Amino acid sequence: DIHTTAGKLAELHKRREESLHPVGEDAVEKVHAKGKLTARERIYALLDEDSFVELDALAKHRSTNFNLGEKRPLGDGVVTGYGTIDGRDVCIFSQDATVFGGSLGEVYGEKIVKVQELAIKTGRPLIGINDGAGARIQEGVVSLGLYSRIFRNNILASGVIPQISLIMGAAAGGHVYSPALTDFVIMVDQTSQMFITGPDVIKTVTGEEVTMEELGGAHTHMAKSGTAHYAASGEQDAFDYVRELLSYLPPNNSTDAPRYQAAAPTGPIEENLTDEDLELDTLIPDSPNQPYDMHEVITRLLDDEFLEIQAGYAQNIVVGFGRIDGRPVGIVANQPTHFAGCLDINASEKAARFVRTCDCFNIPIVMLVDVPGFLPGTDQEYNGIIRRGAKLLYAYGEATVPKITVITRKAYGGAYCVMGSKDMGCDVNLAWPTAQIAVMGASGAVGFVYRRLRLQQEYEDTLVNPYVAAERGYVGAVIPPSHTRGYIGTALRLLERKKKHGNVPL
């Protein structure tokens, strides 16, 4: 009986039950038959058990354009609310591609806005789960106004609260820009795509024939475009990566990144070397041009795992999160097995946005350095190495988080400058006995300086070493490789309490 208190309560229970399958129970069965989670099940999976509080569950669109009034799904195509991840509050939306293809309309947009505003207001991370076709064309330009509002909120929140975008279906059209504006883009391999304009319009306009996967899949946005930070092997893998990612980060820019329990001092660094530490002493090959795996250094410095960022992009540089002595750090490391660890356009941009992200969110930058120069090439100049390589300078000079650099081997020319040089504002500078720090390698310098294999040999035995930079104070300590972990740990402890905006090259 609708006119009684009990009847009103029972009627709410009915609307709620309907909101869980807003376009029919069969639409949910069809999602599950693909092996996929629903918009809201994605949220339950990511969030802590029983932590989700839903907002605007019973929302409905208000358009009457083109018979849209005949179908008004509860929720209007997106699920929004708040909850916890490992006990810490977050805000979240998840788009429902079963409702108008996950196309954004006005009310759907308003729901995302409320949650963006809630995250900004509370100083808490914002997780967006993206899966939708674009703007609900029937609604008209109002859809574009909500895109604008969302983009503007991503910009306002940028570097203030962590913003993570999960791409879990095809994400087409205007709103792919919101992911681009967030800090981390996590795609799911084969099951997610991101593109402005689809293959149909591309074919009609350019004659190019391309699949959605080829056009905007996880592999394309990982390896080619430099846009995806992670290409998950499945949806659960993606949620696992995001939870790991959040565990390194503070809730906002005005809060310390969370630390685990530090270890007690056991005496001098000399006397606290593990077998794994001692392995570093013999890691660098005798031959000064022989490749070695930089991850071998990384894994030996970190307490446990390395959460790598853009692992399938720009393999000449390794970037990611780990902990040293319970403290979150951002690693930036040249990889000698790719272009001999030379920098290039792509490695520069990858590393630069990473450095700025760590800086926003109070994460110390540890550089591991073995850099012969910049990758030579005509396309490098044409494609903007000067303008784009400059972004890494910019990101590093700007950073005020603790900065610690270890030169393991080469550091030559302007690349030495870029990779955590003292005079770019690095706080503590370290070098291995194998460090070679010079304007130019002996090999190319002798042609200028004595204008052959003996002059070379002279210069490199005399000047391509750690000690010239050490006597300038550009390195504060030339150290046994095994002492690296203990040094960084003491330096991180020491450093633990260190314009409208600039004009970074774009």
Added chain:
Amino acid sequence: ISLIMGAAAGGHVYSPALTDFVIMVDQTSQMFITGPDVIKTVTGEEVTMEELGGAHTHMAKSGTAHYAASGEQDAFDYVRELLSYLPPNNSTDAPRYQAAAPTGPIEENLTDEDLELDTLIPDSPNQPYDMHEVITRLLDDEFLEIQAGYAQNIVVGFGRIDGRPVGIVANQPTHFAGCLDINASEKAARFVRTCDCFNIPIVMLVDVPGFLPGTDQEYNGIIRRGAKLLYAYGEATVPKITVITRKAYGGAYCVMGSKDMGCDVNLAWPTAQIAVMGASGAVGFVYRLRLQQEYEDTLVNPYVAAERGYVGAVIPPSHTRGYIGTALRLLERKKKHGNVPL
């Protein structure tokens, strides 16, 4: 400001890149990290210094040079002209020349040049026109164009309106039909952030069908790099005035100074066509040359956006100069850092 006046080789070229404006001398100056000799030995590519790092390379290919001078004196001239628009620092008003007197209603103050705007837009929505024809008629005197030989589907530069320095961001129908692409987005993004750093109002003139469709655009980073223009604009706090002269479709509408991106005053000509997408593409989803004609005559216009308040006024084109000067006076006294896409 960086003047490149001979061959600049090596790591110090990064200094120019970090500066706001790079002025090169054509034929007579180059910039490169690594010379042709190292390139040849490492890649086998053969290239002259001019090809590798000349003004034309850094203008047209790399998006690095803001001006390519005809000679040394021409370089100096440009740098002085550029400085005339700018304050000494971010704490100071950009300098102004005397504003004019008011002389009554807008209609009674229309010059012959103003009225020329009324007939400028072609009847065919597909026929291009040079957007410099609009810019020139809005400005007091000259236009100092920035990166004129780069990403020519967008035009960016400095002028004065009623004695006030302004930064023009305008789509160019004459190249790519005015579509945004990666290079145009980056050119205009950095320009917008430069204007905002140095207290220069941003005036957008909008005729944008969309983004340049294509495979290479996706692969080379249109989403990540196109987003820089949103970020630049959304971050700006200087006066923002946008005039849609014609097309404004889809996400490119959002990008080109949309109200909800924080534009202060939004205007449109009677030829503005503000829609999610063009009639032809829309009818396929929404519902055929009859369907299309009705969609365009019903919805592809300034008025639906006018009714949402996304445009504040649909105006005779001739009235544009007057509205802008008035809005500029109205608006004249309006984190560690963010994490723009790089």
Added chain:
Amino acid sequence: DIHTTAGKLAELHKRREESLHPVGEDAVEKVHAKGKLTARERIYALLDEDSFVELDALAKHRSTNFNLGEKRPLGDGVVTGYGTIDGRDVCIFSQDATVFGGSLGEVYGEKIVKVQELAIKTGRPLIGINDGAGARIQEGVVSLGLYSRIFRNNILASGVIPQISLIMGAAAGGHVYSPALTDFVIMVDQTSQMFITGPDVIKTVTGEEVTMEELGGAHTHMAKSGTAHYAASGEQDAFDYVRELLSYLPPNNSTDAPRYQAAAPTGPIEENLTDEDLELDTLIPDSPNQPYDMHEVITRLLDDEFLEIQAGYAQNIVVGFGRIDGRPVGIVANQPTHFAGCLDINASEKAARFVRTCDCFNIPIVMLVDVPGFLPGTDQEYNGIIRRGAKLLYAYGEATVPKITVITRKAYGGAYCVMGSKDMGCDVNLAWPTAQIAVMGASGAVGFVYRRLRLQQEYEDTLVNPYVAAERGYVGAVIPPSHTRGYIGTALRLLERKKKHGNVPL
């Protein structure tokens, strides 16, 4: 041809023309037949000639509820934009009672929100011209949301930019709270009303029979409710008063009130006494308790006119604007011709809000004091004199603008404290030879002090004077009445470059 540029331009001219009479030419004729101006004619009348720039002229409502979609007037019932008043920029809205009775809907509320945000962002005054029945029932709760957004913007702008409300027809329902939140309410005598609930509902609910004019006319809100600041003698007079009012005020709280040319002096104060100044020497009656009108002092201090606020309310105190030596000042003056200048609840609230407005808008406060105490009476207690009288204390103790006080005659007890005492934070304190400053009058005091006509006289003659206060430094100068103008002029020049929020009693 609507497919041509020329045809598109012609169609715009056509839409514009229709917007000037959005519900037909006949409706305009009916307005004029009453002698009233339209919404937009009120704007053209107020603003400088040819200065108006209209916004959202062609807006239409987007509601389909209850056959609403059949009537979509251009402009949605409100005229909004910006222009100038005396060459300075203002923002403005003007409600159209011919369009849905001037009732607010979503789009109408949107247009008002746009000019509020524009005023706040530009740091320019906001003028609202109010004439209408309040929320469109047909649109539903969305109209109430827009009300809320408008009220909230009024609060946000409060004390930041001058907000003036012109009430120019019958304003009924929720929205009359917006004028209340603004700084000044100007009503038109006979021809404007405001009330929350109309006479019809009041009769059905309470049985009281009342006219709209009796309920909420300009005179009612002037004399009884304390809500109207000016009761204008017609629309044009209301416009004239607002222009004058704005001439005293800066554009926002960050800007000095605008000044006219200061005079130069002809030597000392004593040597620049006009005949008008000298009249002040003989103005105070010989008989201690004989009334004199305080306007006789005010008009002789001021350069030209006195713009009086709430002239017909709480006439025991006089407040308003004038200029001294080209400088805007806010006068707060006891009126000896009403209650002998005694403070009461209504006078306290009138002066308190005026003081806080002056302080928001950088206007020096000049007090002219002749106050025997507080109006005695049981209803003064029952209706809140302790709570409401305190507000004048709060306002004054909070003020940081230049404060100058002149005691012309009486200042007794707690009312002495209230009326700009030294120890309440007054900057410069002056008194006339006729000042009587004491805990209480001689006649009440003798009862206590000597616990008889001889004792009074001894007490009066010894203690009831300017000098005991002058010796404690409570008055800085006892001065000839004629010197007052010269003294306030020098003090204003000397003083010209002089919590979340508090908890004022409400």
